[PDB]
């Protein structure tokens, strides 16, 4: 990845064995839990598309999942070649060149072109545009690894209310719902899917109470 | 490997014990899975041919595999001595010298010659030419470690469709097929080798559907 | 070991606890496998003879093996005192001094003399001359730890041909044969010591075929 | 310990948690094997007497052994106060002061005095004088942890000759004999304490043969 | 001007008062002698077009000469806008922009654009393209300040031959003739325009003799 | 002035005695010639308004001229307080503050505020806004020091044409006319104010000829 | 010229106005005295051939002398193209190229080629080879500026002997005689060309006395 | 000269035009006054023998004086070849070499050898040994430029006593007498060569009074 | 002098030609005016005693004055050898040594000892102790160069009162009186030695008025 030294010149360093071993052991332990994506965004900090393709290629299993990631990048590369068309023929374009969809993806671009693109006065964040293509592709992977939906999450009879909300928001995080979708679930679905006793306890609280004073009610 | 310091002078550092222990423990755990090559390309970042020969020589087992790697490099060294012939006798060639096939391979070249070759204004990437000789040799190693072919990958009766595509593209990655070869398999071989029920479900989708909306069909 | 900083001045650093723990744990796991030597040459990168003697002295077991290493260095130190004789009496030799066989070995030389010898404009690689004395001594150690010779390596009846070549070149690497010795074994000993069936399959290939197309024949 | 930076100014760094954990785990695994001393000399590289006293004080067990180390340092501190007497009264000695036996040992000296003493143009190696007091004290510790003497090391009837020389020089290293003492043992004690068969094989070799051609004789 | 620091980053420094006072005092002493141009090329080393326009604007007199320099730059700026046309409309050209003829001349370009243009991986030498426009304009200025032509340079009767060749090549340097034009003058015009006596002395030398053995002839 | 170091941090240096002596000796030699302004813009490169007020205050004579410069800055400071009004009361504005007209002029601002204003991520060029106030004030000073107008510049009878164009554009530079004003003078006033003989020579050239081929005509 | 920074990287700096003004004012004061060459060798320290050609081109007068310098360089450039012939056609010579006689002279070589040539591991001192061509050419210039020969240097009747030896060795330095030529003059020409009185005083000293005890004799 | 940078590595810089112009203008103003030597020792601070020979070669006049300096160095070079003889033949002396008398003098040594000699751990101060040869040679030059001896320095009748002691010690400094020689002159020659009146005033002071209370006596 | 670099290590630089030429030209213009001492203290900032002796030795004239400076230093060196006696014999004093009176004066101390003495943790300011010996010696020199005493300073009849106080305090500064001595002169000698008219004007002011309201009274 590109790093900032003491001076501020964006020099290029190679990916460490610590970062390589960290990303591989996340996927081996947890397959495609929703917290893997937050981890990916942190291990690949300022990474070149050569370094971003290295982290995807070192994953051993989940080859059905990595084909969805490969088809999503090919959809975004074709979208980038449509929204950003070529101006004219490169008769006098210099050594630099406007990146296509296959140059941001690291397929038709060398390492020296990717280091230059990110260091331009007006930096072309090809390491950041390609990261949003993987993350949008990783959100589709973790959506099919969700074992259940939010409509099937109901509280057990001997299950405490802290374990039910733990299962409720773990399923809601797996379906990758938005803030507006999650706001409707915490006011119209969390109370109604509880046990009858706790549910009543929660209908007496009022129309909308925060979860800090809710869970304590059913302690 | 050569590293870039704060100034930008390509100084030479030695290979760390972290990088030495990382490459050895990859080969011990997974023998010659196709993800070992992506790992190799990452641990040997800007490595001199002395450092590239060190990583090949620290592998304990798989001496049948390392002899294929040794014969592939000797084929590429003889090819480099044919496509890049000697101009004339080195009467006044200076301290520098045009590298042969045995100097890129690190056999007849010292460490001081390899550091110089890579630091020349027009750098002679002898650490990168030799890396493509190992990677081309490593692709032949992982092709013979594939336990089965793509024609023998069929879906089981109780096997879910996510596990069948996991086995299908793990075998396809082991045979190291190209993008054109893999494009024919995902449109004429993935559907036809499934279970009858799922296969029908997939023939009703149309001529060519993406895998994101395919696997979900047979959920 | 001497390291190169950002400026290029060969400053002296101490051996890290990572490098100390790496070299000790190699010898504990594998005793004197032929890949230990390649590892030694990598952990002791630019090491002073004080640092090279530290790595030999931290090995707990194999005291029969370390006495062979001690007698080999004493043979090379006496050889260095014969091929490099003293010119005259050091009446005005300055603070520097031409190293003897016992100064390269780190016995009669201080640390400040060894740092100076390696930093001279014409560097006296006393850390590299002494490393070739250990490596020549380590090759004699791993030759007596070979459990069998190459004439006793024969293919089993149910043994696959990939496992036979794995055992053949592991024994050949343990005896430390040269390239000319190994070239005669791969054309006159590898085929003849196989199983009858495979051997025939290999006599029909021709006089000399490469191992990439050979092993596949007996797949 | 004092380290050398890029410029060459001997700045003071603190002992790392890696170096602290390395020295403690050596003593926990192997109690006082003779290879612990070589390890100590490597982990405490350029260490101040504050840092040298820290490594001795973090050892949990072997309090009988650490009292021998404490009494040996007190013997060397009293010896240093005799061989290096005070010149006169320090009426105008400046901020610096000639170190006593209790200032090299780190008992009556602060950290700022020990950093100064080592950085003087004529450096007073108080971190190196105190290290020879511990190492001389550690040699007395490992001499009493030797389980047997060299006169009780005899070859077993079914014991191979490689295992007998392994036991012979491990006991000889535990008694910390000199080179002249070890030269008499390898010519008058190694052969005579072997099995009768091997011993004869070794008397036919001649008066004095090297161990490389000896052990092979009794292979 | 842009300068190279210790690291190699092309930082921008301001023009020194030493460089400002040097260029002004050249023009005050010698008006437009042909050696002023060589001086200009040396004082403006790596100068931005803001810094190149500063050196032209600090010249007090010779406003007839500076209008020829202004009209020559306007001719080269219109030529640059013809040989380097605009590719298309700058809908998505980024912060950078292809320089026109009025941006290299420093008229329609800010200082931050000129520093960027010269620091691009493929540097656009706008400080060097504009310098060739001034130097081509300065050659037209010094051609009209020549007080005489080469056909009017004849040797005086009491004038020594060293002073005649001094006047001959000072006039030839003022007319800014090429190497092919000067080669015809030194073989067909230098001898024939001398005094009769010296001329004869030079016709006896042969067809073409070098000036080192010629001037000595007429000493 | 603020300077850029090797790292790129805009540190503050003091004005050198070389720069102080350079600016004073320009005004002493030439009073308010139009080339003084170009010099001022070069000596005050990246200067703080404290440093810009220092250069104006070290001028000994021309106190009638410096009062015009003081009244012009007070006009621009009142204009800046009108075009850039205060948003609201600074209840929570932090340590930084939006500069008024008297803070850019260096009257009500300290040195620490001016260094901060220029170093902000979005730098407030208070050293550059104040420089345009002096330069606009200096253009009014040099307009009243012009000894004659352009209508009184006529060619003398024995005056050569190179000296007439020297006097014509020195007067035109003193009146500070624009490019459109100077374009009308070089096509309708330069020819008509010459000597009759030269004028005719110039009417035969055509409607509009460049000065390079014009002055030569009247050589 | 190339300078060595703190790190040791041979960065390129421009020639200072101090060095430009120093070399010009030497030639203006003393025309071609023999001490100008020693000065030239000192002002042009590590100078590129672009910088060496700049110092020759800023000399105003002595155009007869600068044509001898131009013809001497053309003789050495043709000699360099004969003693260093081209090996073969540059089909694959890289970005670097073996310098011809016109590339060392700075005629057909750019600045970027000259900086590279001097920075090569085996540096091609093109700034030092070209300096010996100027210095050999400058020795021919100062030989023709000698006003008299050594045979015409005789002591005057009222001239003291210190002034005669001052005139004797100033003429001998102007003719650029070698050490063997000057050794014959100080033993067979210095005594015989003196005044009769002093000469006798010097014949009584003996065959060969040093000048320290000679001049004192004739005090 | 060799300079010490921020790190402490003795890099080589070239002699500045300021130092070159300073040493030349000392000799032009004052010919060989005794204060020129102190100046020389200060301008040539850490100078290489190439740089020391440059300062001697840029002196225009005094060629009788520079021949005494040349003969003194040749006497010291022959003395150095006698007191420091060659040990043996340089069969294996490395790149470094023990300097002769002609290598310290800068005649048979290159610049790269002189930089190395001074940077050796045990630095061979060839720039300091050669400086003592010039200074010993410069003391012989200034001894013959003394216009009078100390026996001819007598006080005039109207001359004040401050001007007589000014002339007395200027002549004593020109003859380069030692401290023991000058101690005898200030007690037996200063008083006796004064005017009768002052002399008496000084005989009444006593046997030996300091000059601070002496000159005041004759105020 | 010792300078502080960016890091803070007190490296040793040589005295510049600017500092050498500054100190010499002060003494040539003004002989021993009282402002020369303040200048000396500023040019010799952190100077070693080698550098302090260089500045005293480059003074051409005033050899009567420099002998007073030499005798004052010899008085202070003998005083330093009495107030700071030797403790005992230097049997084990190390490389460092307590400085005597002749080592601070730079007579019996090398440059390497003086750099060390000033860099000690407890720095021995030998460059500052020796500076107070010169300054105490320079105060005795400027006391004898005073042309008149304070009792002979009387106001002339047509002399204005500003010129009388200018002459009064220039003589008082030449006699180097203390603050208590100068306080008695400004209250009992300044008024009484004026002209009668002004004196009366000053007796009407009162007992003691400041000089700001005094000189104005006699305007």
Author numbering:
A (entry chain L), B (entry chain K), C (entry chain J), D (entry chain I), E (entry chain F), F (entry chain D), ...: 1 to 219
Reported in the publication:
We developed an affinity-grid method employing monodispersed single particle streptavidin on a lipid monolayer to enhance particle absorption on the grid surface and alleviate sample exposure to the air-water interface. Here we generated streptavidin affinity grids with monodispersed single particle streptavidin (mspSA) on lipid monolayers, which allowed for high-resolution structure determination of challenging samples. Affinity grids could alleviate both issues by enriching the particles on to the grid and keeping them away from the AWI. Taken together, we developed mspSA affinity method which enabled the structure determination of archaea MCM and in complex with dsDNA, HIV-1 CA Di-hexamer and ScPol II EC, while providing essential insights into DNA replication initiation.
The HIV-1 CA protein is a critical structural component of the virion and facilitates essential life cycle processes through interactions with host cell factors. Previous studies of the cross-linked CA Di-hexamer (CA A14C/E45C/W184A/M185A) have reported a significant issue with angular distribution. The biotinylated CA Di-hexamers were subsequently attached to the mspSA affinity grid or prepared on a holey carbon grid as a control. During data processing, numerous particles exhibited evenly distributed 2D projection views when prepared using the mspSA affinity grid. However, the majority of the particles on the holy carbon grid exhibited a top view of the CA Di-hexamer. In both samples, particles displayed stacked CA Di-hexamers. A 3.14 Å structure of the stacked CA Di-hexamer was successfully reconstructed for the sample on the mspSA affinity grid. However, due to the pronounced angular distribution problem, we were unable to reconstruct the structure of CA on the holy carbon grid.
